[PDB]
Scaffold this active site. Sequence first.
Site, PDB file in Angstrom:
ATOM      1  CB  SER A   1       2.841   1.638   5.949  1.00  0.00           C
ATOM      2  OG  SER A   1       1.969   2.062   6.688  1.00  0.00           O
TER       3      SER A   1
ATOM      4  CG  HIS B   1      -0.281   0.370   2.288  1.00  0.00           C
ATOM      5  ND1 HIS B   1      -0.309  -0.830   3.047  1.00  0.00           N
ATOM      6  CD2 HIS B   1       0.146   1.488   2.916  1.00  0.00           C
ATOM      7  CE1 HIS B   1       0.180  -0.214   4.316  1.00  0.00           C
ATOM      8  NE2 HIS B   1       0.392   0.815   4.058  1.00  0.00           N
TER       9      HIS B   1
ATOM     10  CG  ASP C   1       0.088  -4.022   2.228  1.00  0.00           C
ATOM     11  OD1 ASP C   1       0.508  -2.952   1.255  1.00  0.00           O
ATOM     12  OD2 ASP C   1      -0.246  -3.040   3.379  1.00  0.00           O
TER      13      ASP C   1
HETATM   14  C1  LIG Z   1       1.195   5.312   1.570  1.00  0.00           C
HETATM   15  N1  LIG Z   1      -0.078   5.875   2.615  1.00  0.00           N
HETATM   16  C2  LIG Z   1       1.389   5.004   4.366  1.00  0.00           C
HETATM   17  C3  LIG Z   1      -1.235   5.583   2.927  1.00  0.00           C
HETATM   18  O1  LIG Z   1      -2.268   5.629   1.168  1.00  0.00           O
HETATM   19  C4  LIG Z   1      -2.243   5.411   4.204  1.00  0.00           C
HETATM   20  C5  LIG Z   1      -2.336   4.622   4.477  1.00  0.00           C
HETATM   21  C6  LIG Z   1      -1.803   3.866   5.547  1.00  0.00           C
HETATM   22  C7  LIG Z   1      -0.774   4.503   7.015  1.00  0.00           C
HETATM   23  O2  LIG Z   1      -0.960   6.235   6.875  1.00  0.00           O
HETATM   24  O3  LIG Z   1       0.258   4.231   7.125  1.00  0.00           O
HETATM   25  N2  LIG Z   1      -1.540   2.634   5.962  1.00  0.00           N
HETATM   26  C8  LIG Z   1      -1.433   1.679   7.089  1.00  0.00           C
HETATM   27  C9  LIG Z   1      -2.503   2.020   8.425  1.00  0.00           C
HETATM   28  C10 LIG Z   1      -3.452   2.707   8.542  1.00  0.00           C
HETATM   29  S1  LIG Z   1      -4.302   2.155  10.310  1.00  0.00           S
HETATM   30  C11 LIG Z   1      -3.047   1.351  10.360  1.00  0.00           C
HETATM   31  C12 LIG Z   1      -3.153   1.003  12.144  1.00  0.00           C
HETATM   32  C13 LIG Z   1      -1.621   0.333  12.858  1.00  0.00           C
HETATM   33  C14 LIG Z   1      -0.596  -0.376  11.221  1.00  0.00           C
HETATM   34  F1  LIG Z   1      -0.039  -0.730  11.781  1.00  0.00           F
HETATM   35  C15 LIG Z   1      -1.200   0.689  10.618  1.00  0.00           C
HETATM   36  C16 LIG Z   1      -1.901   1.664   9.945  1.00  0.00           C
HETATM   37  C17 LIG Z   1      -2.453   2.094   5.266  1.00  0.00           C
HETATM   38  C18 LIG Z   1      -3.102   1.074   4.927  1.00  0.00           C
HETATM   39  C19 LIG Z   1      -3.499   0.188   4.346  1.00  0.00           C
HETATM   40  C20 LIG Z   1      -3.698   1.350   2.781  1.00  0.00           C
HETATM   41  C21 LIG Z   1      -3.720   3.195   3.426  1.00  0.00           C
HETATM   42  C22 LIG Z   1      -2.913   2.961   4.537  1.00  0.00           C
END
Ligand SMILES: CN(C)C(=O)Cc1c(C(=O)O)n(Cc2csc3ccc(F)cc23)c2ccccc12
EC number: 3.4.21.39
Length: 226
Positions: free
Chosen positions: A182, A45, A89
């Site tokens: 991430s 992601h 992912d």
């Molecule tokens: C390129 N990015 C970073 C984005 O597009 C924004 C995004 C993030 C983020 O902001 O990290 N995460 C991780 C995340 C979201 S809630 C959470 C809670 C605990 C945890 F460990 C990880 C996470 C994603 C997962 C799938 C899709 C998109 C995102």
Amino acid sequence: IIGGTESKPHSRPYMAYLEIVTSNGPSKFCGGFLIRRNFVLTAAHCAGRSITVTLGAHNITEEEDTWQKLEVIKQFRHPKYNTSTLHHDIMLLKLKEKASLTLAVGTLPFPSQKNFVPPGRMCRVAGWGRTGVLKPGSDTLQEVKLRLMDPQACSHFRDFDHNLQLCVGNPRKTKSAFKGDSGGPLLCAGVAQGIVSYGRSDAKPPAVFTRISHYRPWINQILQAN
Ligand SMILES: CN(C)C(=O)Cc1c(C(=O)O)n(Cc2csc3ccc(F)cc23)c2ccccc12
Ligand SMILES: [Zn+2]
């Protein structure tokens, strides 16, 4: 990283700070980890139109000689990455050049063993992500020790799959990987077993990590082919 500690600077020399560019919004950031001098593993992601990797960082706001800002020449997002389920992912980033090995920058190659990591142990994840729901990303690398949970602890992530993912972070604690972490490795006894994937917006653990063991063949495939 919520509820973690500031990493000893450069203590996780494989950590990569990814700045991910998209056409239609500002940079986003992820972690990742250098598994070969020219490959960083991260979450799918975190794909974007382009990605920069900074290795050797601790405080990502403070340039230092340990930094290596490396261009990613290609992203290898897992072909089955599913933006709905967030299965698979995982993504490899091929750096345009091999990173320099320094004290502050080194790879974290996988051990040969790719044993499935069952629930129960404590692992550590590091990242520059947010240190709470309302908190910007940490300037400094943070890390936290989290419990591998039984998969049922992640049942509420309806697309969680124990075979694909680790369920990480005792829900009794606030400690968790979070946004911005991430792609960071979850190290269990110094072995990367997980990649931060996703979790709850509200940061309540557990969070879901890609279970690396499952993707070792794919990782190898990409590495061997590239
Ligand atoms: C390129 N990015 C970073 C984005 O597009 C924004 C995004 C993030 C983020 O902001 O990290 N995460 C991780 C995340 C979201 S809630 C959470 C809670 C605990 C945890 F460990 C990880 C996470 C994603 C997962 C799938 C899709 C998109 C995102
Ligand atoms: Zn330094």
